[PDB]
PDB file of all heavy atoms in Angstrom:
ATOM      1  N   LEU A 108     -19.604  -0.854 -15.911  1.00  0.00           N
ATOM      2  CA  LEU A 108     -18.616   0.030 -15.305  1.00  0.00           C
ATOM      3  C   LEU A 108     -19.153   0.620 -14.010  1.00  0.00           C
ATOM      4  O   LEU A 108     -20.166   1.330 -14.023  1.00  0.00           O
ATOM      5  CB  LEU A 108     -18.292   1.189 -16.250  1.00  0.00           C
ATOM      6  CG  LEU A 108     -17.356   2.298 -15.733  1.00  0.00           C
ATOM      7  CD1 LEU A 108     -15.935   1.787 -15.527  1.00  0.00           C
ATOM      8  CD2 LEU A 108     -17.316   3.522 -16.712  1.00  0.00           C
ATOM      9  N   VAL A 109     -18.507   0.315 -12.891  1.00  0.00           N
ATOM     10  CA  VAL A 109     -18.773   1.000 -11.635  1.00  0.00           C
ATOM     11  C   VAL A 109     -17.728   2.072 -11.471  1.00  0.00           C
ATOM     12  O   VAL A 109     -16.538   1.791 -11.497  1.00  0.00           O
ATOM     13  CB  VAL A 109     -18.719   0.044 -10.449  1.00  0.00           C
ATOM     14  CG1 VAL A 109     -19.189   0.742  -9.218  1.00  0.00           C
ATOM     15  CG2 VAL A 109     -19.571  -1.204 -10.742  1.00  0.00           C
ATOM     16  N   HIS A 110     -18.136   3.320 -11.328  1.00  0.00           N
ATOM     17  CA  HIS A 110     -17.126   4.365 -11.230  1.00  0.00           C
ATOM     18  C   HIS A 110     -17.430   5.418 -10.188  1.00  0.00           C
ATOM     19  O   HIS A 110     -18.548   5.499  -9.693  1.00  0.00           O
ATOM     20  CB  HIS A 110     -16.930   5.033 -12.599  1.00  0.00           C
ATOM     21  CG  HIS A 110     -17.952   6.074 -12.926  1.00  0.00           C
ATOM     22  ND1 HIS A 110     -17.750   7.413 -12.661  1.00  0.00           N
ATOM     23  CD2 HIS A 110     -19.163   5.985 -13.527  1.00  0.00           C
ATOM     24  CE1 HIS A 110     -18.794   8.107 -13.096  1.00  0.00           C
ATOM     25  NE2 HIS A 110     -19.667   7.264 -13.620  1.00  0.00           N
ATOM     26  N   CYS A 111     -16.405   6.192  -9.833  1.00  0.00           N
ATOM     27  CA  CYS A 111     -16.590   7.430  -9.084  1.00  0.00           C
ATOM     28  C   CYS A 111     -15.625   8.452  -9.677  1.00  0.00           C
ATOM     29  O   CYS A 111     -15.357   8.391 -10.875  1.00  0.00           O
ATOM     30  CB  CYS A 111     -16.425   7.179  -7.589  1.00  0.00           C
ATOM     31  SG  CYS A 111     -14.902   6.265  -7.086  1.00  0.00           S
ATOM     32  N   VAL A 112     -15.108   9.405  -8.910  1.00  0.00           N
ATOM     33  CA  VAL A 112     -14.237  10.422  -9.506  1.00  0.00           C
ATOM     34  C   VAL A 112     -12.879   9.804  -9.836  1.00  0.00           C
ATOM     35  O   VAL A 112     -12.400   9.924 -10.968  1.00  0.00           O
ATOM     36  CB  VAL A 112     -14.116  11.699  -8.644  1.00  0.00           C
ATOM     37  CG1 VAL A 112     -13.256  12.766  -9.359  1.00  0.00           C
ATOM     38  CG2 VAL A 112     -15.490  12.256  -8.373  1.00  0.00           C
ATOM     39  N   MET A 113     -12.316   9.128  -8.834  1.00  0.00           N
ATOM     40  CA  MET A 113     -11.007   8.495  -8.887  1.00  0.00           C
ATOM     41  C   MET A 113     -11.098   6.981  -9.128  1.00  0.00           C
ATOM     42  O   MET A 113     -10.155   6.369  -9.600  1.00  0.00           O
ATOM     43  CB  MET A 113     -10.267   8.751  -7.557  1.00  0.00           C
ATOM     44  CG  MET A 113      -9.879  10.236  -7.271  1.00  0.00           C
ATOM     45  SD  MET A 113      -8.375  10.430  -6.233  1.00  0.00           S
ATOM     46  CE  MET A 113      -9.089  10.043  -4.624  1.00  0.00           C
ATOM     47  N   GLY A 114     -12.222   6.381  -8.761  1.00  0.00           N
ATOM     48  CA  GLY A 114     -12.404   4.948  -8.843  1.00  0.00           C
ATOM     49  C   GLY A 114     -11.589   4.145  -7.850  1.00  0.00           C
ATOM     50  O   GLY A 114     -11.194   3.020  -8.155  1.00  0.00           O
ATOM     51  N   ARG A 115     -11.330   4.714  -6.688  1.00  0.00           N
ATOM     52  CA  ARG A 115     -10.515   4.080  -5.662  1.00  0.00           C
ATOM     53  C   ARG A 115     -11.259   3.748  -4.343  1.00  0.00           C
ATOM     54  O   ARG A 115     -10.847   2.827  -3.640  1.00  0.00           O
ATOM     55  CB  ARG A 115      -9.342   4.987  -5.306  1.00  0.00           C
ATOM     56  CG  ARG A 115      -8.550   5.495  -6.483  1.00  0.00           C
ATOM     57  CD  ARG A 115      -7.786   4.391  -7.181  1.00  0.00           C
ATOM     58  NE  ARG A 115      -7.195   4.856  -8.440  1.00  0.00           N
ATOM     59  CZ  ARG A 115      -6.725   4.060  -9.401  1.00  0.00           C
ATOM     60  NH1 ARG A 115      -6.723   2.738  -9.272  1.00  0.00           N
ATOM     61  NH2 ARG A 115      -6.207   4.591 -10.493  1.00  0.00           N
ATOM     62  N   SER A 116     -12.315   4.511  -4.000  1.00  0.00           N
ATOM     63  CA  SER A 116     -12.975   4.443  -2.665  1.00  0.00           C
ATOM     64  C   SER A 116     -14.461   4.110  -2.741  1.00  0.00           C
ATOM     65  O   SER A 116     -14.853   3.039  -2.337  1.00  0.00           O
ATOM     66  CB  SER A 116     -12.771   5.760  -1.903  1.00  0.00           C
ATOM     67  OG  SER A 116     -13.438   5.785  -0.652  1.00  0.00           O
ATOM     68  N   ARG A 117     -15.281   5.020  -3.261  1.00  0.00           N
ATOM     69  CA  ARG A 117     -16.725   4.803  -3.325  1.00  0.00           C
ATOM     70  C   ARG A 117     -17.065   3.594  -4.195  1.00  0.00           C
ATOM     71  O   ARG A 117     -17.796   2.702  -3.767  1.00  0.00           O
ATOM     72  CB  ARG A 117     -17.458   6.040  -3.864  1.00  0.00           C
ATOM     73  CG  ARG A 117     -17.527   7.211  -2.872  1.00  0.00           C
ATOM     74  CD  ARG A 117     -18.051   8.428  -3.557  1.00  0.00           C
ATOM     75  NE  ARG A 117     -16.966   9.068  -4.278  1.00  0.00           N
ATOM     76  CZ  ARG A 117     -16.958  10.337  -4.666  1.00  0.00           C
ATOM     77  NH1 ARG A 117     -18.005  11.142  -4.427  1.00  0.00           N
ATOM     78  NH2 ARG A 117     -15.887  10.820  -5.261  1.00  0.00           N
ATOM     79  N   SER A 118     -16.536   3.580  -5.418  1.00  0.00           N
ATOM     80  CA  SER A 118     -16.905   2.531  -6.343  1.00  0.00           C
ATOM     81  C   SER A 118     -16.377   1.205  -5.828  1.00  0.00           C
ATOM     82  O   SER A 118     -17.086   0.188  -5.848  1.00  0.00           O
ATOM     83  CB  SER A 118     -16.404   2.829  -7.754  1.00  0.00           C
ATOM     84  OG  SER A 118     -15.073   3.300  -7.751  1.00  0.00           O
ATOM     85  N   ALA A 119     -15.136   1.238  -5.352  1.00  0.00           N
ATOM     86  CA  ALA A 119     -14.478   0.056  -4.840  1.00  0.00           C
ATOM     87  C   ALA A 119     -15.349  -0.546  -3.742  1.00  0.00           C
ATOM     88  O   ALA A 119     -15.570  -1.765  -3.709  1.00  0.00           O
ATOM     89  CB  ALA A 119     -13.048   0.405  -4.321  1.00  0.00           C
ATOM     90  N   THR A 120     -15.848   0.297  -2.842  1.00  0.00           N
ATOM     91  CA  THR A 120     -16.643  -0.202  -1.715  1.00  0.00           C
ATOM     92  C   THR A 120     -17.936  -0.887  -2.172  1.00  0.00           C
ATOM     93  O   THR A 120     -18.352  -1.854  -1.557  1.00  0.00           O
ATOM     94  CB  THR A 120     -16.986   0.897  -0.735  1.00  0.00           C
ATOM     95  OG1 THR A 120     -15.777   1.534  -0.308  1.00  0.00           O
ATOM     96  CG2 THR A 120     -17.765   0.336   0.515  1.00  0.00           C
ATOM     97  N   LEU A 121     -18.557  -0.414  -3.255  1.00  0.00           N
ATOM     98  CA  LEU A 121     -19.784  -1.042  -3.760  1.00  0.00           C
ATOM     99  C   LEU A 121     -19.510  -2.393  -4.416  1.00  0.00           C
ATOM    100  O   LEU A 121     -20.268  -3.343  -4.252  1.00  0.00           O
ATOM    101  CB  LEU A 121     -20.556  -0.104  -4.708  1.00  0.00           C
ATOM    102  CG  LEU A 121     -21.170   1.166  -4.080  1.00  0.00           C
ATOM    103  CD1 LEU A 121     -21.882   1.973  -5.181  1.00  0.00           C
ATOM    104  CD2 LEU A 121     -22.153   0.872  -2.925  1.00  0.00           C
ATOM    105  N   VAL A 122     -18.398  -2.509  -5.132  1.00  0.00           N
ATOM    106  CA  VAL A 122     -18.029  -3.783  -5.716  1.00  0.00           C
ATOM    107  C   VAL A 122     -17.618  -4.772  -4.625  1.00  0.00           C
ATOM    108  O   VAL A 122     -17.896  -5.955  -4.716  1.00  0.00           O
ATOM    109  CB  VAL A 122     -16.935  -3.600  -6.773  1.00  0.00           C
ATOM    110  CG1 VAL A 122     -16.400  -4.973  -7.256  1.00  0.00           C
ATOM    111  CG2 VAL A 122     -17.505  -2.754  -7.936  1.00  0.00           C
TER     112      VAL A 122
END
Side-chain angles (χ1 to χ4, degrees):
Chain A
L108 175 68
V109 188
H110 81 94
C111 50
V112 183
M113 293 209 283
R115 310 292 171 195
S116 177
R117 287 171 278 201
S118 44
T120 305
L121 293 179
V122 172

